[PDB]
Design a protein around this motif. Structure first.
Motif, short mmCIF file in Angstrom:
data_model
loop_
_atom_site.label_atom_id
_atom_site.label_comp_id
_atom_site.label_asym_id
_atom_site.label_seq_id
_atom_site.Cartn_x
_atom_site.Cartn_y
_atom_site.Cartn_z
N UNK A 1 0.63 -1.19 -0.39
CA UNK A 1 -0.24 -0.14 0.09
C UNK A 1 1.37 1.14 0.07
N UNK A 2 1.98 0.78 0.50
CA UNK A 2 2.67 2.75 0.60
C UNK A 2 3.43 2.62 -0.10
N UNK A 3 3.76 1.66 -1.04
CA UNK A 3 4.06 2.08 -3.11
C UNK A 3 3.13 2.22 -3.65
N UNK A 4 2.09 2.61 -3.06
CA UNK A 4 0.86 2.16 -4.23
C UNK A 4 0.68 3.35 -3.86
N UNK A 5 0.59 3.80 -2.59
CA UNK A 5 0.58 5.41 -2.52
C UNK A 5 1.80 6.29 -3.11
N UNK A 6 2.63 6.15 -2.70
CA UNK A 6 4.01 7.08 -3.07
C UNK A 6 3.68 6.90 -4.98
#
Ligand SMILES: CCCCCCCCCO
Ligand SMILES: CCCCCCCCCO
Ligand SMILES: CCCCCCCCCO
Ligand SMILES: CCCCCCCCCO
Ligand SMILES: CCCCCCCCCO
Ligand SMILES: CCCCCCCCCO
Ligand SMILES: CCCCCCCCCO
Ligand SMILES: CCCCCCCCCO
Ligand SMILES: CCCCCCCCCO
Ligand SMILES: CCCCCCCCCO
Ligand SMILES: CCCCCCCCCO
Ligand code: NA
Ligand code: NA
Ligand code: NA
Ligand code: NA
Ligand code: NA
Ligand code: NA
Ligand code: NA
Ligand code: NA
Ligand code: NA
Ligand code: NA
Ligand code: NA
Lengths: 89, 89, 89, 89, 89, 89, 89, 89, 89, 89, 89
Positions: free
Chosen positions: J69-74
């Protein structure tokens, strides 16, 4: 910039992108191989359950195949139905 | 840009893309090796199931081979049936 | 662009592409090593099944070798039967 | 482009390609180490099968060595029998 | 292009290629560590087989070392016996 | 090209090459950690074999350390005994 | 080339090289985690051997830490004791 | 080259280098997760040893955290105490 | 160089650096999934230890999360509190 | 540099950065699959604990999902709320 | 810079970014393959729990599929709903 130059770098980048996407194929190969190993171990120890073993192996493997297919689809779009050339100019 | 220049960078990118795609071959190598190891362990412990062990090993390995084949196909398209050169100009 | 320049970047890209394809060799190395380990464990346990153990090890390993061979073939095409130089001009 | 420039980038690309191919060496290192571990475990529990254990370990490891050798051969071709310099001009 | 420029990019590419080849060292590190772990587990349970355990560990590890050595050799050729500088001109 | 420019790109390439070689350090870290885990598990079960356990762990780990050392040596040659600067001009 | 330009690309390359070397940190993280897991499993079953378990864990982990330290040292040399700037001109 | 240009590429390289160093974070993530899994398995089977299990898990994990911290420190030096900008001129 | 050009390449490098740092996320994903699997296996066998199982899983996973967070923090600094733009000129 | 050029390279770098961040997705895929495998094995052996098995699987997997999710948000920030374009000029 | 040039490098960067994002596909392939292996092993040992085995396998695999889907969505946004071309000028 002229149109030939624009198409040239967009398609060149597409060739690189398509090749890169196929790296995903590592995954299904590892995972499905594992499932195959377990099926081998199971039919040896349970010849009777051969039907269930093989149908279960194929179902589970098919699911594991999907991201290999996604990458293949992205690569074939970039090669044969490139969406960037039409956006140029 | 002239046509020789355009073909040159599109094909150069294709060479890189094709080599990159083949990295997928790591996967089937690992997975099928595992299946092979389980087949070895199973024919030793149960010589009576050799037929099922080997046919199951081959079926499961064939499935695990598919993304290796996809990458091979993408590389051979880029080398011998390149779809970009025809889109140029 | 002149023809010498065109061949130069297409072949340079081919050298990089060929080296990159060989990265696939990681796979069969890992997988076949695993199969070898299981064969070692099995002949210690059941010395009589040595024939089946080794023939099964070799069959399964051969299958796991294939994507290593595909990458080798792609690299040898790029080095010794390069399909891009002929498309130039 | 002059011939010195052409040789320069083709050879530079070959140096990069050769180093990249050697990355395959990871594979046999992992796999053969595993086989070694299993041989160690097996001679401890079955000193009597030492001959079969070690001959089986070596056979299986040799197979796992092959893609390491392929990459070495590609690298040595690029360094000492480079096929690109002769195609130039 | 002058000769100083040619040597400069061929050698720079050789530095990169040599460093890249050394990535192979990951392999023997992993595999030999595994063999070491099995040797530890085996001498604890079988102090009597210490001789065979350690000689078998070293033989198997030596085999797993080889692709680490291949990469080292390719890197030392590129640094100290560079085959490209002599082909220039 | 002047001599300052030549040294600049050869040394810059050497910095990249040296950093890249150090990636090999992943290997010994993984493998030696595994050997450590097995040593921990073994001294708990068999406190008596502590001497053999630890001496065997250290021997096997030392072997697994070697490709980490090779990469370190290649990186230190590139930084402190660079063999390219002397070949220039 | 002027001296400011030379220092600029040598140091920029050094920044990239140092970051790249740190990738080795993956290894000790994986391996030491494994050793930690085995220590946890062992103190639960054998509370008595806690002394040996923890001292053995720390020794083996320290060995696995070394290539992490090597990469750290290479990175700190590149950042704070850079050996290339002094070789320039 | 002017000073603004020099700072620009040295800092740009620093951003890339810092990001690259953080790739090491993969390691502690894998290893510590493994240790966590073993702690879970152990408190279920040995509620009595909860104290030792958790203190041992934390000690071992802390050791496995170190190369993650090293990379973090290298990245924070490059971002907030950059050692290259001061060497320029 | 003008200030707009300087900010442009420093920020572009920051985008690349931030994306690269996020690669660390692989680690916690693997490790925490493993811990999750052991928790599942443990509550099934030992429903009564559910409290300890889940609290232990969460503690251990939280530790494994940390390098994922470090990379996230580095990426968010580069995007929203970039430290390089202020050092320029 | 004009503003169109500045936006062009900053956004191009953002596209590369976003794609690179998504590589983290490998992690949750591996880890969660493992947890799924353990849940399958557990419901077969303990049909009565199905409730706890599935709720525990989902909780643990959710935790393992976070860096994906963190990578998706970035990546979505870089594509749809890009923070660099506003800093330009 | 003219608008055709701006679109050209932003789209080329998008092609690279999209292909890179698809590398995440490795993960679900590995993890789901493992879950498939465990389902195969479980239906063989326990044919009566086939319903629960397969429904549990599919649920857990679906969760493991998600980051594969995220990467696919990012790649399809970059190819067919590109958010950068509209920000240009
Ligand atoms: C990854 C994109 C490759 C495109 C290279 C184009 C180079 C053209 C130089 O004029
Ligand atoms: C990685 C893409 C290779 C494209 C090489 C193009 C170089 C042409 C320079 O005139
Ligand atoms: C990555 C493929 C090699 C690129 C070759 C370009 C060298 C020519 C520069 O004018
Ligand atoms: C990847 C191979 C590098 C080739 C670059 C050649 C550049 C020549 C510069 O004049
Ligand atoms: C890896 C190859 C590096 C080549 C550097 C070429 C620099 C060209 C400057 O004119
Ligand atoms: C990737 C190896 C470093 C290349 C150094 C080239 C710097 C010269 C730019 O003019
Ligand atoms: C990894 C290579 C960093 C050096 C880049 C050189 C930039 C100089 C541009 O003129
Ligand atoms: C890896 C970061 C290199 C930054 C190169 C700067 C290029 C400036 C061109 O004038
Ligand atoms: C690694 C980030 C690349 C930065 C590229 C800057 C190029 C500017 C072109 O004028
Ligand atoms: C990897 C970052 C992409 C930056 C590309 C900018 C190219 C500008 C050259 O005109
Ligand atoms: C990875 C992005 C490739 C950069 C595309 C712009 C370079 C070609 C125009 O000179
Ligand atoms: Na899937
Ligand atoms: Na497949
Ligand atoms: Na195969
Ligand atoms: Na082989
Ligand atoms: Na070997
Ligand atoms: Na070694
Ligand atoms: Na070490
Ligand atoms: Na550590
Ligand atoms: Na952590
Ligand atoms: Na997480
Ligand atoms: Na998921």
């Amino acid at each position: 910039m002229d149109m030939l130059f624009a198409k040239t770098v967009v398609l060149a980048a597409s060739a690189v992108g398509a090749g890169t996407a196929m790296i995903a194929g590592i995954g299904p190969g590892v995972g499905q191989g594992y499932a195959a190993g377990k099926a081998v171990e199971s039919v040896a120890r349970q010849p009777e359950a051969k039907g269930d073993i093989i149908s279960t192996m194929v179902l589970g493997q098919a699911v594991a195949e999907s991201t290999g297919i996604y990458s293949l689809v992205i690569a074939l779009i970039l090669l044969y139905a490139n969406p960037f050339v039409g956006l140029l100019g």
